[PDB]
Design a protein around this ligand. Structure first.
Ligand SMILES: Nc1ncnc2c1ncn2[C@@H]1O[C@H](CSCC[C@H](N)C(=O)O)[C@@H](O)[C@H]1O
Ligand SMILES: Nc1ncnc2c1ncn2[C@@H]1O[C@H](CSCC[C@H](N)C(=O)O)[C@@H](O)[C@H]1O
Ligand SMILES: Cc1cc(=O)oc2cc(O)ccc12
Ligand SMILES: Cc1cc(=O)oc2cc(O)ccc12
Lengths: 343, 343
């Protein structure tokens, strides 16, 4: 028959057990345990304290989808795909699929995706009892997990956007929602004359300060606890919004942008580090995974290039320049948008 | 880079939003509405009462994964894969992905798959408040949805297993857990001398009786409400277990098989309609989807050919014959296992 391939494709795409099998394997650290020598069901069950027959049934699906393969009778090893769940693999896919860590936990919000399409509003609170950042505020362990997921490569992940801007006429930088300070730190190393301030929430400010202390940068990058919907704590020649605005619906993103514009020194610029696909180029899996996560986690949104033009104008700004940022590590297209005050 | 394809494969397999996007589209009947003429976001939002920008964001992922394509600017149509979500397509994939119907609703149990691997026990009750069949018993609408999902092709789905057995020396058939009576009805049509009894739960017995009345078979197939862990209501030359034993862990499946053996007339046989892959042949997506659903819904299990040999022996039975059943419609390998009393 001719629709057999189509039927197989639809069933795979619609399968909820397959991603949960991947995330279960990640959460149980199965691939790590296999690499450390536990190749049989009976050894792996003892290492994970799972029930042996139930673990075999999980492993069977892991083989079926090509993450594991049966080497010898009853002995399993990771494939090239499965090896990506090793804890120290540079793409960090084990942690990003670990159900006890903040993002895969938040992905359970997708079980109520019909509600989010009807309302345009997040479903996270309906599952976990508080909106996303309030939940993180009440669970410092999840706050720390989220911060480390985003900041994993922060020793070098922010080098490209910091190198993509000319800091010669910048004296003070304000990184609004600046995470653990990785972006501020990368700017400080590249532009030694610059002083920087990180504005962040409780909890995150402490690991930011602690990170900057380890880096020897406390004298050049300070950390302020605060709320970026309130007046910003100081003015700056460059104000950074790195993976901030996508957390927020249009009206909140305009309020944040407005606060930033109000805090700009003369000649200053606002720097947005995010995606900016043209609408025509946005029908791709990288854009939609992040965009739909922002919907169900937060009620935020990724913005196409067209929408950035509109959002800037609403905040009194113009898009002066968009710099494409190289990710020759793993292809994830990101941009640095440079916004200036409108005429 | 060389691990780009591997990384892409892992991320797709681990994506929870993609199957929820498919199920959301199925639940909103999006493909039906498109085929009826609503091709734009603005028309489809009004037909589904969703928020237009949020619906566009869903559609974007549906295009990205190849269920929809943008025909004209802002107009979307289903692909060959997407057309399978039309409500009347014979593979019934819309209903099987509809979150308001019993199976896709039960698939939310997979969000707690780590618990099921640790315990070997279902997670359905922890989500919905009662174990699977008790939940169906308290929600007659879900009971009816489940019964119709399984019985969809019952006018012809049971023709092959009914044709695969020689009914010449059978006088009475008992179909234990016989659903809406489709299998009993197919036997009655092929073997007019046979009389049959369907044993089923509350609710299901009424739609079974109603189905058999529509078929003109009330005089030949009767329906008894009861519990197949209790003594069976009568003896039979052939006792049918069609998609029953996989609902149950080994010790419960032995109890059901034992009840059946105790009710067999001399010379009688027990007929099992299920999968029976050799363990070596079971590392495939058809086996694992059903097997893992039985785990999280019910604590049941699919049994490999080796396990059937063991289960039969535990119940005092031998596997006399296994007949492979043709499904040239869509390839789903099923078998008819014929069990006889052990020597
Ligand atoms: N009202 C608020 N005031 C200040 N910071 C906030 C805030 N709401 C959210 N945030 C911060 O916004 C950040 C978005 S995550 C991005 C972190 C970092 N800029 C990076 O690129 O990786 C979070 O760290 C969160 O703590
Ligand atoms: N304790 C019990 N006693 C009798 N029937 C039961 C039962 N527990 C579950 N069942 C029935 O077992 C059936 C399994 S579903 C299979 C239905 C049908 N034989 C078919 O092949 O499609 C359900 O219809 C359910 O109502
Ligand atoms: C880059 C990226 C990918 C993703 O899948 O989820 C995210 C969530 C965030 O809060 C910030 C960034 C990302
Ligand atoms: C044949 C089949 C496929 C599936 O995916 O789920 C099922 C669930 C049941 O209770 C009975 C049969 C099936």
């Amino acid at each position: 028959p001719q629709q057999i391939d189509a039927l197989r494709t639809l069933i795979r795409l619609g399968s909820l057990h397959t991603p949960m099998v991947v995330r279960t394997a990640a959460t149980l650290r199965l691939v790590d345990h296999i690499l450390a020598g536990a190749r049989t069901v009976k050894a792996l069950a003892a290492r994970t304290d799972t029930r042996p027959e139930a673990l075999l049934r999980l492993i069977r699906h892991l083989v079926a989808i090509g993450l594991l393969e049966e080497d010898a009778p009853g002995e399993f090893v990771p494939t090239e795909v499965g090896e990506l769940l090793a804890d120290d693999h540079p793409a960090a896919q084990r942690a990003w699929h670990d159900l006890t860590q903040a993002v895969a936990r938040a992905d359970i919000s997708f079980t109520r995706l019909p509600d989010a399409i009807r309302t345009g509003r997040p479903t996270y609170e309906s599952i976990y009892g508080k909106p996303f950042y309030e939940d993180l505020a009440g669970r410092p362990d999840l706050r720390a997990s989220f911060d480390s997921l985003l900041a994993c490569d922060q020793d070098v992940a922010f080098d490209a956007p910091a190198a993509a801007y000319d800091w010669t006429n910048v004296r003070h930088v304000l990184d609004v929602g600046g995470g653990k300070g990785g972006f501020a730190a990368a700017i400080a190393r590249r532009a030694p004359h610059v002083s920087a301030t990180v504005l962040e929430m409780a909890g995150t400010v402490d690991t930011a300060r602690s990170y900057l202390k380890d880096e020897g940068l406390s004298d050049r990058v300070d950390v302020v606890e605060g709320d970026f919907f309130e007046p910003l704590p100081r003015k700056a020649d460059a104000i950074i919004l790195s993976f901030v605005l996508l957390n927020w619906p249009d009206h909140d993103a305009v309020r944040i942008l407005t606060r930033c514009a109000e805090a700009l020194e003369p000649g200053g610029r606002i720097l947005i580090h995010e995606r900016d696909d043209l609408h025509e180029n946005s029908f791709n899996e990288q854009f939609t995974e992040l965009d739909l996560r922002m919907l169900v986690f937060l009620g935020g949104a990724l913005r196409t290039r067209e929408k950035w033009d509109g959002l800037a104008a609403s905040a009194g700004l113009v898009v002066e320049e968009v710099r494409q940022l190289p990710s020759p590590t793993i292809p994830y297209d990101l941009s640095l948008l440079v916004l200036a005050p409108a005429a």
